[PDB]
């Protein structure tokens, strides 16, 4: 497939019950889905290389990986993490995190491309998954 792409966000759904499994205070959780709903995700694909950058209004950030190699990220509320993703199939990944001190819930994600042109991220800590749905621009 090809991920590569510049793509907004249409559908995020049960992202402040993750973040209350993080622990994330109520107002906060309230502002941070608030900054959900703004979310772009502009991806580079070469081969299995994927530089990935995810954005709000006021914060930017890039997730570089290659699949099968380990790389360091953070978590969803920001603890540094060791990440390793695979695929699943011929259209989606699944990443793996591991944190780098400490303990919590455990969390990973996934993308994937549907056959209709969407792009689905999720998000999972513990039992709770966020699913997000972005279109290109
Ligand atoms: C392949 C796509 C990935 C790994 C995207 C992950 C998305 C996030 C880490 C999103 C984070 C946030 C927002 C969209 C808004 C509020 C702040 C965060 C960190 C919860």
Same mark, same amino acid.
């Given at each position: 497939?090809?991920?590569?792409?510049?793509?907004?966000?249409?559908?995020?759904?049960?992202?402040?019950?993750?973040?209350? *499994?993080?622990? *994330?205070?109520?107002?906060?959780?309230?502002? +941070?889905?608030? +900054? +959900?709903?703004?979310?772009?995700?502009?991806?580079?694909?070469?081969?299995?290389?994927?530089?990935?950058?995810?954005? %709000? %209004?006021?914060? &930017? =950030?890039?997730?570089?990986?290659?699949?099968?190699?380990?790389?360091?990220?953070? &978590?969803?509320?920001?603890?540094?993490?060791?990440?390793? *993703?695979?695929?699943?199939?011929?259209?989606?990944? *699944?990443?793996?995190?591991?944190?780098?001190?400490?303990?919590?819930?455990? =969390?990973?994600?996934?993308?994937?491309? %549907?056959?209709?042109?969407?792009?689905?991220? &999720?998000? =999972?800590?513990?039992?709770?998954?966020?699913?997000?749905?972005?279109?290109?621009?």
């Amino acid at each position: 497939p090809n991920f590569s792409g510049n793509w907004k966000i249409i559908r995020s759904e049960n992202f402040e019950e993750l973040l209350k *499994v993080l622990g *994330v205070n109520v107002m906060l959780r309230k502002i +941070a889905v608030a +900054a +959900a709903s703004k979310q772009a995700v502009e991806i580079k694909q070469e081969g299995d290389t994927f530089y990935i950058k995810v954005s %709000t %209004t006021v914060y &930017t =950030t890039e997730i570089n990986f290659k699949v099968g190699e380990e790389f360091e990220e953070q &978590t969803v509320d920001g603890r540094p993490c060791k990440s390793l *993703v695979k695929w699943e199939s011929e259209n989606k990944m *699944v990443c793996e995190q591991k944190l780098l001190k400490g303990e919590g819930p455990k =969390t990973s994600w996934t993308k994937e491309l %549907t056959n209709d042109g969407e792009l689905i991220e &999720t998000m =999972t800590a513990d039992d709770v998954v966020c699913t997000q749905v972005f279109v290109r621009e």
